[PDB]
Amino acid sequence: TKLKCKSLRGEKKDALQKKLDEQKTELATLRVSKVTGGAASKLSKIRVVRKNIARLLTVINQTQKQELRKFYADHKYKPIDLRLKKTRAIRRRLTAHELSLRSAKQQAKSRNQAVRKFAVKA
Amino acid sequence: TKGTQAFGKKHVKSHTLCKRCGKSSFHIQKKRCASCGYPDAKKRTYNWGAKSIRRRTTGTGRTRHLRDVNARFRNGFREGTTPKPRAQ
Amino acid sequence: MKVNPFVSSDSGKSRKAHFNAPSHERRRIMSAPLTKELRTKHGIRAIPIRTDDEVVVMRGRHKGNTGRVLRCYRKKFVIHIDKITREKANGSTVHIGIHPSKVAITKLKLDKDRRALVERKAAGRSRVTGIL
Amino acid sequence: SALKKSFIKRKLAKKQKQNRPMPQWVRMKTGNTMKYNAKRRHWRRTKLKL
Amino acid sequence: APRGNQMLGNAHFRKHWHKRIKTWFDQPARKLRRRQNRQAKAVEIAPRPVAGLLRSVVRCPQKRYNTKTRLGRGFSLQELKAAGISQAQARTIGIAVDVRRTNKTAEGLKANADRLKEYKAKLILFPKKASAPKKGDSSAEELKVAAQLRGDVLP
RNA sequence: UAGCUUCAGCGAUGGAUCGGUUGCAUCGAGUAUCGAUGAAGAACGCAGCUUGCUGCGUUACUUACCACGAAUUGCAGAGAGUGGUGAAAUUUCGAACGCAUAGCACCAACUGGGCCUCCAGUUGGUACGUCUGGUUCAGGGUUGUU
RNA sequence: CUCAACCUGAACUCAGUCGUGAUUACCCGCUGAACUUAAGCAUAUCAUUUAGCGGAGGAAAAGAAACUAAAAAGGAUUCCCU
RNA sequence: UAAAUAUCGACUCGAUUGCGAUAGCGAACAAGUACCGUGAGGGAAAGUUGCAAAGGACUUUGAAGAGAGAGUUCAAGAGAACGUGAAAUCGCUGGAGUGGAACCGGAGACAGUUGAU
RNA sequence: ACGUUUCCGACCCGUCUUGAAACACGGAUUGCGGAGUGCUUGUCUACUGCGAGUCAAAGGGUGUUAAAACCUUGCGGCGAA
RNA sequence: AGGCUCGGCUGGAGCUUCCGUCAGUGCAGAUCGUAAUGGUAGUAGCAAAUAUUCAAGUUCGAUCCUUGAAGACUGAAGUGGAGAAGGGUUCCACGUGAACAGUAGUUGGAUGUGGGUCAGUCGAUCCUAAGGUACUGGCGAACGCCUUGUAUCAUCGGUGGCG
């Protein structure tokens, strides 16, 4: 019946592949039942089997992408699909450190000129 | 003889379906779409065609990516984080 | 009179929200008042009605009848109560929809979540009544 | 024409699928207003300008 | 066809004026927005005056107005030197500096010099680091009286 | 008598009027967020029964996670289902990218055909312009050395 | 004639980047009519405006005087009243 | 090189001396849809049963549409194209007129209507 | 009284026109919709407040039945040559 | 007088006096817009392409559907048998009540439910024709245009040895 991704999170790659194959075989059997005048009770399981396949694929992809992200976390250049998907303009923006960069003249101006805190009596 | 007699000779299409807009306005001999301008890189729109612009403008379709971006902006385009690990 | 600038007193907006509310919001909309005895027993005034509750009809042509609620037809904003039925022409039996606001709860179907909700409501009622 | 293109055939197949009477059980749905498929097409009356 | 004694028409409506129309239905909204902006700025820069920099005293240019005075952009370098304030010190203390204005008359210079002196007298200077006050820095019971000024400084 | 006209009563045809109103118009307020990480738009497809509309993309009227807490509903059917949404996924055309523009072709690996120079499958890749650097170069253009 | 520099110019499926195309309410640069009014009409007007092309942002553009002026002088830009 | 300034095109909100289905956006509804043109493009009509389908079981004539009974319902003369249901137009029953128009104003009569502490 | 019958009178409305019942044009019938408006600028007139003054602009202050109301002008418009 | 009050019937949820003030404020016409409806009127008409008849079947019901017999027609440059463009399921089978088939209908290119198109050899796919469109180059305020040409031009690939 309805699988639990919480349980699936503990299986291995081979086990998940085997379970996916079993679910696909069950779906094929249900399609055969559909075509050969199957009962409504049988036909009602197609949605459950399809969503079970979806859950298995979700777990597989999540595990694979987590592993790849860990592997490439330290590389200077990462695969395009592992980079941050913000807006195009946000990606083209300057980095925080580059924005924080200041020239020698600017640093000297910051040192010398500095606004104070004051109040004016009415 | 213009009219009924001449209408019997109309069996060669001058326009076909366009790859970009799906309209039957692609001129075969000119190799250009009379509606969207394919294969021109840019899109065909004229300010005198206000109703045409309204018909073919953004928002008349699905705007799947635009809606996705609008939804994601509401939380600052946060990535690499998941909801607090909890249960039922 | 409302004071919140972000709450609309527009009849059209209110009606649109009511009639396009999603299921979880219709759950809150379909609330019923507790009887006097149950109100003193549990400390709350009203709760979102639930299946398997026991109610008594307080108004309408079926006033005074009692039974268990079978279904909460949220799509139709009504609840079907046990034994509140009529007969179609052919003879079959059909439950008569009743609006939960016109019944009164006589017994609550309590589980973990419902007990927690009742406790929350009672604590809030105690706090606000003490402040008042 | 007998000698046609696959994409024209695909469009014709979709039109064939679309040209179909409305299911009868849809008329029993809550709030339903449709009483028939109001977009039925007859091959001889209305023509697909492909 | 004008008839009888009339003043000849002059309305400038021969252009497609319907394309360029401006209404003022948002005047109170703009007023509220500017009040809110002033409040936000006051919170941001408290306890400093909301008006901002101190402005100088000026004489209106032409003879039609030269009997009046108004606020200026800032204080000239001559004025700052006469009042004994450096340009940098004025910038950090919150005094507008008009680098373009120059004084050609002792009376005009002296009026603004007196204005600067009075502002310096009324000024309250908080410690740069609260723990360690320095010289020129205002005293603690003076700092306890500090309040935000609203409107023009030294109106 | 009949027919015709007219009056009273009754009934048709027709859909005016009245009664609201999840719609429209205008005013005001808050925010700044499309695209080669593939946009806008288009095409096709996806449901147990579901043409259209709406939703979605081969995990296809949706998966995961989190909040709430018992339904969906036309018939079936069996932590529900709703909301949020940070994880995963997101078909083909389209700036649309191997070349063309509704077709055919090149490179590499791996797998199968028994072997493979021949086939088949899978995967990855081959667009234009431009910046920085790298490698291999061309010119008595200028110069030095043998 | 050998080798080595520079200069200029190439090829690379060389390593890593970037541009293209959309949107129209506002914004920036160009191009640019006629109807109409003149009781006709050509300068004029409509109008440095419909239409056409290109280019951005959340605002854009402008902006710290080769300024205004002629007082006992004002002092970047933008916007409002006059 | 920010601020004051412009702008609802996009997203999200609050209002109104505005319209109330021939009005208001073209579109209150499977509306930029049906449909039309080779194409640029053009472009509608279409809101309302009832509180609740309780949407008329069953008998009867007919091949059927449909009708006669019956039942539901505050009510079905609210019966599905279903709130109300106008005028034009039309059919029936009864009365009265009726020689190439008919209608109409003034004045009586008849029929008729209505009032009488 | 839009019924019938008598006596007298009785040409089809709208429109342009010197002149329409016209052999002048529009009108088969009914429902619903349908046309001197908005704004800027003048002038006269009527009413209201103040009066050699009057109105105050943008703006500012306040106001939460906060787009309102209330307060606020060396200066500006018109008038006083 | 513009109109108004009341009575009776229908109807089922709003309406109203008076005081100020405002207006998308009054229709017989505009060959007015839109929707509906009359007399004409059961009238004009349903007359080109030679032609049908008998018996039976099915059906509630047959000039028109089906079977048999007869009589005619196209007459091989056909009213025959197949294709290209175009159509797009109209193809085939089984039901059919309403609409449509300007009579009818048991029949149908209609309508409801299903079924149906199988390629190494037939075509596309491949070659180029007229011609189109790119690259450079030039022009152009620009979208982009012009040339398909020694204009432009550093545009490569073939045998062999070695490996």
Automatic annotation (TrEMBL), chain B:
The keyword Ribonucleoprotein applies. It comes from the Eukaryota. Component of the large ribosomal subunit. The ribosome is a large ribonucleoprotein complex responsible for the synthesis of proteins in the cell. Binds to the 23S rRNA. Belongs to the eukaryotic ribosomal protein eL37 family. Coiled coil: none annotated. GO terms for cellular component: cytosolic large ribosomal subunit. GO terms for molecular function: RNA binding; rRNA binding; structural constituent of ribosome; zinc ion binding. It comes from Caenorhabditis elegans. SUPFAM superfamilies: Zn-binding ribosomal proteins (SSF57829). This is Ribosomal protein L37.
